[PDB]
C-alpha cells in the first residue's frame, strides 16, 4: 500500500503525540500535520478536574461507638453493626452508578466537540470543496502552505477563489 490519508470516522491517529484534535493535509509540495491548540485545551480543562468534584467537602468528624479491645453487649452489638453493613451498601452502590454516569458523559461529550470542528471547517470553505466521506475535504483549487495555515487559522477569504473553483467543480 502507499499514500492515502483519512480522518475521524475511519480510525484514530497514532502519530498524534501533542494535542487531542488536529489537522492533516497533502498537496503538490508535501504532507504535514499540526494540532488545534484551542479546542484541545478546552476539553482537557473540563475533563481532568472531575476527580476533585467527587470529593466530599462537608467534613464531619466521626467518633468511636464500639471498643476494639473489650466486648460489647450482644443485644446492642447486633443493632450497632446491622446499621454499619446497611450503610456501607448505600455508598458502594452510589459510587459504581455515579462514576459510570461521569464516564458515559465524557465519552459522549468529547466526541461532540470533534464534530463541531469538522462542521466549522465545512462552512469556511463554502462552495470550493466537497466531502469525500472519510473526514476530509477535497479542495478544488491549487493552494500552498500559506492557504493551509489560513484554513487552520480561520482567515480563509473564500471569495477570491470561487471563480477558479466552480470551473473545476462543474467541469466547465
Amino acid at each position, epitope marked *: *500500500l*502507499f*499514500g492515502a490519508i483519512a480522518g475521524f470516522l475511519e480510525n484514530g491517529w*497514532e*502519530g498524534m503525540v501533542d494535542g487531542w484534535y488536529g489537522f492533516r493535509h497533502q498537496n503538490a509540495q*508535501g504532507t*504535514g*500535520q499540526a494540532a488545534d491548540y484551542k479546542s484541545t485545551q478546552a476539553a482537557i480543562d473540563q475533563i481532568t478536574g472531575k476527580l476533585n468534584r467527587l470529593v466530599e467537602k462537608t467534613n464531619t468528624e466521626f467518633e468511636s461507638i464500639e471498643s476494639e479491645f473489650s466486648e460489647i453487649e450482644h443485644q446492642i452489638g447486633n443493632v450497632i453493626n446491622w446499621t454499619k453493613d446497611s450503610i456501607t451498601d448505600i455508598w458502594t452502590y452510589q459510587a459504581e452508578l455515579l462514576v459510570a454516569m461521569e464516564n458515559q458523559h465524557t465519552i459522549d461529550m468529547a466526541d461532540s466537540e470533534m464534530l463541531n470542528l469538522y462542521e466549522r471547517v465545512r462552512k469556511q470553505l463554502r462552495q470550493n470543496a466537497e466531502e469525500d466521506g472519510k473526514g476530509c475535504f477535497e479542495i478544488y483549487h491549487a493552494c500552498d502552505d500559506s492557504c493551509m495555515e489560513s484554513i487552520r487559522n480561520n482567515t480563509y477569504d473564500h471569495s477570491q477563489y470561487r471563480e477558479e473553483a466552480l470551473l473545476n467543480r462543474l467541469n466547465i
Partner: antibody
Amino acid sequence: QVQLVQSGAEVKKPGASVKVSCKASGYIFIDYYIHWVRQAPGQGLEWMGWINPNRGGTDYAQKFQGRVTMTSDTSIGTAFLELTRLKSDDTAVYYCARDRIWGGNWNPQKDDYGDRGGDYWGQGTLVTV
Amino acid sequence: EIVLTQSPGTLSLSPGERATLSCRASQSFSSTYLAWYQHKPGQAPRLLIYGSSRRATGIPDRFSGSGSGTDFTLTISRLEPEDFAVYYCQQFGSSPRTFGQGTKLEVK
C-alpha cells in the same frame, strides 16, 4: 514499541562496495525520514544523508555526492545504504536514525520544518576496509 | 554550508556542581533549528533536547538549555555520576545538516 535493527559487521577490501540494511518495526514505515550517521574511529559524528520513504527522494552531503546511494522497499520496510569505491578511510560505524515528525516535502533537500531530530537510533554496524 | 563550533576543552568538573556548554554557528537561524545529543561509548547516541528549548521524552528535568540568534547553550543544573558523556550540537537550518565537533566531559 519502536525498534530499528540492522545487519552485522562486515569486512571488504579497497575498491569494493557494501550494502548496509536498516529494518524498522512497530510503526508505519512510509512516514518519517531516515537519517544515516557514521563515526570513524576517534572522529566525531558525520551526517551522510536522509531519504523520504514515501516516494524515494534523497539528499546527500557534498562530500559523498556521486558515491553513496539510498533506497527503500516499503513492502519489506527496510532502508538501505549502498557505498561504492571504498577507500581505506571508509572504516567506521554506520547508524540509522528515524526522525520525530510526520511531515515531508517530496524532496528533503527543500524541507523547512521546525523542531526535529533523530529518535530511535538503531544500533550501528562496523564496516572495515 | 553552516558550520558549528562548540566551547572547547573537556571541562572537567566534580560531581554535584553545575556545568555549562555553548554552541555557536557562522550565521544566525531560528532557535527551533537545533538539537542536543548525548553519546556514550559503545552505544548509539540519544536525543536530549529538540528545538534548543524543549526536553525529549522521559528526559530528567536536570537537563535544560536556552539561547537565540548566534549563541545556544545547554545547562546541567546538577551533575550525577551517570551522565558523563560526549555531547553534540546539530542544526536543521539548511542542507546539509551538520554535527559540531563535540564536547567531552570528565570527572576531576
